[PDB]
Ligand binder design. Structure first.
Ligand SMILES: [Zn+2]
Length: 188
């Protein structure tokens, strides 16, 4: 199957935000994030009202192109074996959450898809949003992995049972020079 990618603000008015940037830059025109391998990618979570205690935030990657959407996105044969473990993320997972000991990594028993989920934290004092720092652990160009195929990251706001409360998404290109590729794609 293929996880839904339909934007859904839900009852809490959930949506993502990105900084204005290089190692990580977001293009609103392309709804696409360009980043270097294993570098911090700040993603903001915005809500109109605070969701219930127990709400969680999950991130999962899927291939963007129809002919590849059914294939599970995972790290390539080289990166899954480089022992760059952080102590929590399984080595096959493309997406990691940085600096959160409550992050949980899932390998779905029915879809076999990977995801990382953390508890939703309401904004701190003096802040209007919550920021999650993600890392992408394989290049878009990795052979035997994404192999130049574009991916989408789907972020979902879920209740304590895992039911859907909100959804947003963005394309991602993990590359050596985000700045250059961003300009090229904006141009085209
Ligand atoms: Zn790789």
């Amino acid at each position: 199957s293929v996880p839904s990618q339909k934007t859904y603000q839900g009852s809490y008015g959930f949506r993502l935000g990105f900084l204005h940037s290089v190692t990580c830059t977001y293009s609103p025109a392309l709804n696409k994030l360009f980043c270097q391998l294993a570098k911090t990618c700040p993603v903001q979570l915005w809500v109109d009202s605070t969701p219930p205690p127990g709400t969680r935030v999950r991130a999962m990657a899927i291939y963007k192109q129809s002919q590849h959407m059914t294939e599970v996105v995972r790290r390539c044969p080289h990166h899954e074996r480089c022992s760059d473990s952080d102590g929590l993320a399984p080595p096959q997972h493309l997406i990691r959450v940085e600096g959160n000991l409550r992050a949980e990594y899932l390998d779905d028993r029915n879809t076999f898809r990977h995801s990382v989920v953390v508890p939703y934290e309401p904004p701190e004092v003096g802040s209007d949003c919550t920021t999650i720092h993600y890392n992408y652990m394989c290049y878009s160009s990795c052979m035997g992995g994404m192999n130049r195929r574009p991916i989408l990251t789907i972020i979902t706001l879920e209740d304590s049972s895992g039911n859907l409360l909100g959804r947003d998404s963005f394309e991602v290109r993990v590359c050596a020079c985000p700045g250059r590729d961003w300009r090229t794609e904006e141009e085209n």
